[PDB]
Amino acid sequence: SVERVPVLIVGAGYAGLSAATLLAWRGVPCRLVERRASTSRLPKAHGINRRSMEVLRVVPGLEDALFAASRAGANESTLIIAESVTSPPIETLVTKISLDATPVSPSRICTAGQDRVEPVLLRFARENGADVRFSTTLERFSQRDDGVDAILRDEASGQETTVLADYMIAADGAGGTIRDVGGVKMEGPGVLADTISVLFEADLDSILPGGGFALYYLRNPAFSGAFVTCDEPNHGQINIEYDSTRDQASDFDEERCEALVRQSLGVADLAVKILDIRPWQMAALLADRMSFGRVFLAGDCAHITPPVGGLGGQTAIQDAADLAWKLALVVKGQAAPTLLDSYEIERRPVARIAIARSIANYVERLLPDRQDIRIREDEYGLLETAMGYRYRSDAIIADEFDDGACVEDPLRPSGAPGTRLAHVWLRRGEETISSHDLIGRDFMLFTGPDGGDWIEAARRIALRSKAPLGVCRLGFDVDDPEGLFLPRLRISPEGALLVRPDGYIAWRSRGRSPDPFATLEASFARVRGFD
Amino acid sequence: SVERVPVLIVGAGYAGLSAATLLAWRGVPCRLVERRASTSRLPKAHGINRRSMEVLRVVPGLEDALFAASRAGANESTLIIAESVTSPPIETLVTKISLDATPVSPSRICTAGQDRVEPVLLRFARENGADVRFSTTLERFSQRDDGVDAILRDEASGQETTVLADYMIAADGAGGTIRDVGGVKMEGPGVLADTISVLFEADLDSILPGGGFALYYLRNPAFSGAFVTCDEPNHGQINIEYDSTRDQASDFDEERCEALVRQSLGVADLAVKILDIRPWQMAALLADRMSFGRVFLAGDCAHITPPVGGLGGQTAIQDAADLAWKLALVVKGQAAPTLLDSYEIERRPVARIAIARSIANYVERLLPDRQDIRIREDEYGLLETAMGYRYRSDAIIADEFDDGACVEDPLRPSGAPGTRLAHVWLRRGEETISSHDLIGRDFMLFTGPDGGDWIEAARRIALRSKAPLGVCRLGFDVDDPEGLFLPRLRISPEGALLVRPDGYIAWRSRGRSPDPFATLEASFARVRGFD
Amino acid sequence: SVERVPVLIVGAGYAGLSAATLLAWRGVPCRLVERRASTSRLPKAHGINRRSMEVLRVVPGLEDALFAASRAGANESTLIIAESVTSPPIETLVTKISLDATPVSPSRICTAGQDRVEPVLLRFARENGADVRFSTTLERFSQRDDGVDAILRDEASGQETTVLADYMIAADGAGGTIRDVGGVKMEGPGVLADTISVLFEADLDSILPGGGFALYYLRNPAFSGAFVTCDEPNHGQINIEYDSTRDQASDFDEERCEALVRQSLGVADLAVKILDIRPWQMAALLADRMSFGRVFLAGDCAHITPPVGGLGGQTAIQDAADLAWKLALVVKGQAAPTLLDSYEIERRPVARIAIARSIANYVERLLPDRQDIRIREDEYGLLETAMGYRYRSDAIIADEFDDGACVEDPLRPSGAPGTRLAHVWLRRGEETISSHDLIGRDFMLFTGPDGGDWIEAARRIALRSKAPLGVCRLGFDVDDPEGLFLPRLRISPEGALLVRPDGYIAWRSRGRSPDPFATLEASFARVRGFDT
Ligand SMILES: Cc1cc2nc3c(=O)[nH]c(=O)nc-3n(C[C@H](O)[C@H](O)[C@H](O)COP(=O)(O)OP(=O)(O)OC[C@H]3O[C@@H](n4cnc5c(N)ncnc54)[C@H](O)[C@@H]3O)c2cc1C
Ligand SMILES: Cc1cc2nc3c(=O)[nH]c(=O)nc-3n(C[C@H](O)[C@H](O)[C@H](O)COP(=O)(O)OP(=O)(O)OC[C@H]3O[C@@H](n4cnc5c(N)ncnc54)[C@H](O)[C@@H]3O)c2cc1C
Ligand SMILES: Cc1cc2nc3c(=O)[nH]c(=O)nc-3n(C[C@H](O)[C@H](O)[C@H](O)COP(=O)(O)OP(=O)(O)OC[C@H]3O[C@@H](n4cnc5c(N)ncnc54)[C@H](O)[C@@H]3O)c2cc1C
Ligand SMILES: [Br-]
Ligand SMILES: [Br-]
Ligand SMILES: [Br-]
Ligand SMILES: [Br-]
Ligand SMILES: [Br-]
Ligand SMILES: [Br-]
Ligand SMILES: [Br-]
Ligand SMILES: [Br-]
Ligand SMILES: [Br-]
Ligand SMILES: [Br-]
Ligand SMILES: [Br-]
Ligand SMILES: [Br-]
Ligand SMILES: [Br-]
Ligand code: NA
């Protein structure tokens, strides 16, 4: 049996499920295959940061559903370093007060665990048309010049079928083997720590009186680890590091783990139900390339990060967001296949900074002595890393005076191409909407109120079906009373600003042009891979 | 037989009197000459911010005195934008509740005017041994090999005199011609507005509710300007911009200024007695050099900033305090004269951002239509600009992988070298002091409780070194009960932290060193100009 | 004794000042004479194209100075066809977006006009040792077997002077008479148009939007011409074609040119200050020969091109560069005089297509009505003409199966001997450089990573060959991560590539050689004019 599909996604985690929901929503028929039988697995990741939600909230209903699926609710997150969760805090890294005082995004922080997120993505992936098939395995594949030939295998029978796809998203995890087909090599420090993860049930309401969602980095003299509060109330997980020379994963039975749950919580005796025990590793590795022919590595198969910064799942989501909009343009013929060359160019350095940020969080919060393992070249600030990372590819018309910075303070936007369009409230009559509520579907061209020569130029381009472009004239379609949009992005009232479907600035004009149509038509062509 | 002096100061505004007050307190005999007969002139500036009060409070008694000389007192400051001082607010920028909600400093805001501040500074300069000669003018000068040959002149007789100085601080104001001797070119936007300042007396208690300090930025349809309250009660000041192509300075006689006072106040029946009228310019200019030879430019002669934000007089004070401690070391043989090369490389960027900040306050507050004059690359937060600027020079051992950040949030301190040592309520036994109460006089070495290797290295250093070095070990000399000092500065219990006499961090070690003496000795030598 | 100088250059335009700058930078003492008293003239040309900037950039500081002297800054060029400079464009041929999206060269487009470009060249010629004497004329000359003896004449006085010179670069412009001493015939269409050129001053700021360089081809119903922005702010220049039978050059007084400046600008009520009015012509003529004896014709004196392509000032520069590296070898005794026979062999066909390209642009852009003047036999693409021209001569060891093509697409390089070395971004350690940053001074030998046999041959050659030979290995000295250089030029890792001082490939071996010393020696010798 042989069927064809535009996009084939292998893997039903954060990367693959996001890729399918966004590719579905943007009108691209896809099929997702996943070896497991359901999303039902132990939670690993907790929380969706602001940028992850920005790329996901273009899908109607998705954001509220993610927040409804959470126990703690919006911005209700605390981060503490201590010797145990009942010990005096060594330091307090984040609170609801601190998240509320950083209005850098139309979205707040969502705290939901992976065990709650993956079903909601599956839900919206299917509602918008994705073909998600569980208990189905990519057995093997090869690439002809016009598509991928994939062999699929039913886990219940072993019966095989062939699917032909224009493109395939390898989303197959840290241990994923699709990349080996392409000879990609994971480079980096490698495995830095052996860990053992324990899921337990216990009276957590009393120990943690006023925290909705809590994460404690436990830095004590017996061991190092962390404790997280799960979405199921009175459920929690600890991830304790162990030395593979002094102990072994087999050595952690129910009796021993109940003591670890009590040591890490700072309680002498507490009734602890051990629900599951898992040995894991903490590694730092980056792929040398993130795509080969028509195969695209997304998520943990492209970049393994130390799970200390909580950046792994978010890079996976944003990886899958970058693929979704770009692939949706290529299969519709609104972009050249060359646009897909920009994927590892833009997304790989982002992964290099996450790995470095994550290593730095691990030293600073858990093992401050181990400064040798850090990559201080690539370290940047926490919000800059999650949210101010910059892109530089042929998918972007750089500013003439580009300083080459890897990040930009989201608090001090310059409006340079390659940066994430700033969040600013605007006015659409008596209602107020974020600038981000005006982007995310097609490209968008913002012009100042004197930007009518650009508007007409954009409307001649947007006449074409090949051309996915809309226009917004400031002071006509929406008003910026405070001057915090186009003035702060250094756009004069005769200027124009082009933003991608992922919300990143692609091109700007401080002011007027001798021929606005030719300027814009050439900008628009170039950034979609045409010449 | 010619009079000889270590430092000669020219001019007795904020810059010059600050320089003399601090130079004298630091044991340096100095002479300040000033053309005018006394301090008594009508005041332009109002207020001393928290950073300026921080460099001034190292002088015993000086901080209380300044607060005592003000009509309104600590944090009693209100900033409003409207169409007249009795029109409904258009915005509100600053309140006593806003400034009480920011415990960034050992000091609060002092609202005293120029006409109040300068006599107090004169008081303490002379008290600390400064030689302040009014009615005396620097007529001309020439730098020799071994000093500056100055020709002083008496305004009463025309009699002239020679003094030889090791160094000369040029504090001669926005128009000062000392800089023209050095080829100093002032660069920037230049004159931005023509203004007229009216000092008046009216029943201000009737139409102003609070009894504290009030500043109204005025956006009339007829004119833009500002109203301020003066320290003499029922005295106020309006600084109104005017178009030089439509009206000229001479056109503003008592009658017209009486009309302007009533317009800008909103009461068209109020009796107004015009005490002075003054034309003035609003300008933006920066010097290419802030030193040449043994001459140093401090205050308005080095940087003319628009007077919206009140940064011009605060920079002057802080220029002066930078000179006072570096000069004090160099004339004491305790630093190499190379240290003075750090004056303009540390101070000129601080003035660069203040010029950009004041332009931005001006546009945002008074002329939102003039977005084009802004210098947006150099604009930072209001509290970053006044207080979180950073210093990069050879007077500062920069921590490697420096990101080049021009400011740092005072609220989120990192302890990196070239930043202002954070304010933290420590405990000296039962006394509760500020971290700032332990700095200011000599170089200070803080260390963590396990940092005794540094301490003894420090003590052996100071035996030889010409410059003192104070030490203070945490948990011993002072106590940090809530880990908000050395921990938050990312200094381990075995680390150390070298703070300059101006309170800025010169060098840090996160932990131990294999030869702590050799690293401290090298550091301490390098941060005083030796190589 | 007589004043003796290695190369005498006559004329200080693009050709002559480029020859002087490059000769002096290559170590050749030379004398340039120019009849005029300073470089100060009216701006004619605008722009230095990418290829011209490659041959000029070898001289340290020169490229930065040319961009520094220009009002508009790199790639900030708009070409537009319209009825007036305020009419809606008929077609826009070029934008900065279009120019930035063509990474064919290390250099970008400099927009500086002739009045800016000529002082920069004179400055760099002199910094490098060139002897430039204004208010000096070549009065007459003759050739010997050992040089040209020249009579120089002072314009202030008419005092005359003899100088004997190994070689004489004839760079004396379209009107130049040096070629007539050689009996050089100019051949081709001849004069195609009479034109008048008006230099004016007007508030162009409040008319032109963008603040960069702009050239407008005017398809006005009343007339055909062109407006150009000048480097001096609020200065422009119009080149208006007039019918010599209906009007004559003397009929364009200040009142009429002010009218022209308003029509071709489209602004009815505009203040025009006429600064100069000049009648000119627009011709297409190619020289019989481009050298005779020790005299080499460089610049417009060897090829007059219609000024629509904008290739005449560019061909002059590249003429000069070709002569400069070749004379520099011959006068240093590092190359046989034979090498100079290749000058006109290689440069004349390049002028032939520049003329054909320029005629084709004048017709397409301004007068589409009469294609009868086109030389379609020699028309090629714009970038192919400017940049992808090919050299065939006894100075390039032609590979087997020569196609015969006059041009090659610079975007699809093949590595054939006789083509320009492709611009490839390479890595030297941490820094990223161009392949071109590695060429320009001496002959360069590129080998693959497994080409030590060539490098060893080359280092022993260089040890006693009169000319220097540099070597660079693609595994060691610089890195080519994306295999875009030697793989794409069809060179295996045991191959080598020989590149001339002008950057054109002279010889290639795709694999190993049975005697790598023998083949490299005979190749290095032949490409320098030595026989067998
Ligand atoms: C202890 C821990 C805590 C973490 N905490 C956080 C956190 O707080 N925040 C955060 O953002 N991130 C966190 N992370 C990281 C985050 O969980 C992962 O980065 C993220 O889930 C990776 O998603 P993915 O889609 O790349 O891969 P995966 O979740 O690995 O999914 C890949 C899927 O591929 C399937 N598959 C593989 N091969 C095939 C095949 N041939 N056919 C079919 N299916 C196949 C597998 O069955 C699997 O479901 C944490 C990680 C750990 C270990
Ligand atoms: C309307 C207005 C409002 C302002 N408001 C504020 C505010 O709220 N807050 C604030 O911080 N700043 C404010 N400023 C700015 C502030 O007043 C100045 O920046 C500050 O006074 C500069 O001090 P200075 O010592 O550099 O110079 P000046 O005050 O100009 O003093 C220099 C002195 O040098 C003397 N002098 C010059 N040449 C000689 C010579 N040859 N011999 C002897 N003496 C000489 C002069 O007589 C003069 O007194 C305001 C300015 C204006 C115009
Ligand atoms: C309207 C117009 C626009 C143009 N636009 C462009 C353009 O955009 N781009 C471009 O590349 N080209 C352009 N050109 C062409 C460009 O101007 C020429 O190709 C170039 O300037 C020729 O340089 P040259 O050195 O050959 O000659 P010339 O500029 O003619 O210099 C020759 C010199 O020789 C001197 N001379 C002559 N006889 C003697 C003697 N006996 N002794 C001493 N000195 C002597 C002359 O005084 C003269 O200065 C344009 C031309 C025109 C007319
Ligand atoms: Br975030
Ligand atoms: Br299913
Ligand atoms: Br709970
Ligand atoms: Br992670
Ligand atoms: Br706007
Ligand atoms: Br299109
Ligand atoms: Br002291
Ligand atoms: Br402050
Ligand atoms: Br003076
Ligand atoms: Br000020
Ligand atoms: Br401590
Ligand atoms: Br070109
Ligand atoms: Br031309
Ligand atoms: Na469209």
Residue numbers in the entry:
A (entry chain B), B (entry chain A): 2 to 532
C (entry chain C): 2 to 533
Paper text:
Diffraction data were collected at the Advanced Photon Source (APS). The structure of MbnF was solved by molecular replacement and refined to a resolution of 2.61 Å. RdmE is 39% identical to MbnF over 96% of its length and superimposes with an r.m.s.d. of 3.2 Å. All three monomers of the asymmetric unit bound FAD in the same general conform­ation: the ‘in’ conformation where the FAD is less solvent-exposed and in a better position to interact with substrate compared with the ‘out’ conformation. The two phosphate moieties of FAD are positioned at the N-terminal end of helix 2, implying that the dipole of the helix may contribute to the coordination of FAD. In all three monomers of the asymmetric unit, electron-density features interpreted as bromide ions are observed coordinated between the isoalloxazine ring of the FAD and the N-terminal end of helix 2. The presence of these anions may indicate the coordination of negatively charged groups present in the substrate. It is also of note that adjacent to the isoalloxazine ring is a channel that appears to be large enough to accommodate a peptide. Moreover, a nearly identical interface is observed between chain B and a symmetry-related copy of chain C: the A–A dimer and the B–C dimers superimpose with an r.m.s.d. of only 0.56 Å for 530 Cα pairs. The substantial binding area together with the presence of the dimer in two crystallographically non-equivalent arrangements suggest that the dimer might be important under in vivo conditions even if it is not directly observed by size-exclusion chromatography.
